[PDB]
Ligand binder design. Structure first.
Ligand SMILES: C[S@@+](CC[C@H](N)C(=O)[O-])C[C@H]1O[C@@H](n2cnc3c(N)ncnc32)[C@H](O)[C@@H]1O
Ligand SMILES: [Zn+2]
Length: 262
């Protein structure tokens, strides 16, 4: 019911687990137990045995254990609008960072039928392609079905963007989001990072993370604003990974290029 509990349990935080205990107490009329009965995150919860659940909660552990197994068997369907917004947030983050890091002069947006830039304030020439452009944006979209066998010698300037545009094989100069390996041989998996160049502001649980690429993290003292934004971005990113999307990137992508922007 709480949005985080619609993620796969491996994504649950320690607070998410506690909210799970409360949701389950109401849903199954269980004896209330201390919010600290399972002080761990979901990754840890999944390593417990059923005996551990029974020892930890004599009155309800077996039920909680079986509930978790039911959740792992029938994963919660996500909300389509929330997942769309999440994926869009990630798209903007990732493409903004790529352009800042490598200063591509042209972006080839392949599989974009609406001619909408995810990063409209970047200094880059944006070009759109789609096999079936929306008829109200086709005037500025190249009608093109991409196949590596036909186009691998094209679009070699700048960077290519394939945001959920499933082609036979991506070219090496690509940013890719794919929903569920030979399509990806020219690329590498893209690890999580958060980048921001917005002003730092101090007015939380201090954020410690090597993947918060902000000016205030150069010295390890993340400001409250970026702590907040990092955590919101991580929630959006978890919701897109938990739904089956994965990110891939051109092999030269380097987060130190982002640090150097400061
Ligand atoms: C999930 S939709 C929209 C993807 C878009 N990049 C986005 O972020 O919303 C997939 C799009 O890719 C187009 N498409 C699928 N295969 C394609 C291909 N091989 N070459 C060009 N466009 C393709 C479809 O016509 C459609 O507009
Ligand atoms: Zn900051």
């Amino acid at each position: 019911l709480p949005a985080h509990l619609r993620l796969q349990p491996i994504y649950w935080s320690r607070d998410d687990v506690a909210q799970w205990l409360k949701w389950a107490e109401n849903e199954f009329s269980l004896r209330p137990i201390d919010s600290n009965t399972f002080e761990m995150n979901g990754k840890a919860l999944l390593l417990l045995t059923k005996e551990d659940f029974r020892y930890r909660s004599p009155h309800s552990g077996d039920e909680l254990y079986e509930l978790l197994q039911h959740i792992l068997a029938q994963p919660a369907a996500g909300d389509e609008l929330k997942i769309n917004a999440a994926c869009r947030k990630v798209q903007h983050m990732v493409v903004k960072a790529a352009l800042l890091a490598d200063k591509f002069p042209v972006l080839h947006d392949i599989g974009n039928p609406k001619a909408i830039k995810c990063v409209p304030q970047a200094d880059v020439e944006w070009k759109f392609y789609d096999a079936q452009p929306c008829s109200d944006k086709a005037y500025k979209i190249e009608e093109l079905f991409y196949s590596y066998a036909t186009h691998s010698d094209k679009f070699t300037d700048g960077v290519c963007l394939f945001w959920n545009c499933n082609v036979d094989r991506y070219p090496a100069n690509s940013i890719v989001c794919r929903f569920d390996k030979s399509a990806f041989v020219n690329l590498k998996q893209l690890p999580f990072f958060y980048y921001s160049d917005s002003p730092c502001e101090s007015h939380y649980v201090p954020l410690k993370s090597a993947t918060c690429i902000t000016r205030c993290n150069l010295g390890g003292a993340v400001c409250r604003h970026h702590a907040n934004e990092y955590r919101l971005y991580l929630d959006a990113y978890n919701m897109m990974i938990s739904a089956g999307f994965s990110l891939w990137v051109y092999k030269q992508f380097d987060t130190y290029n982002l640090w150097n922007t400061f």
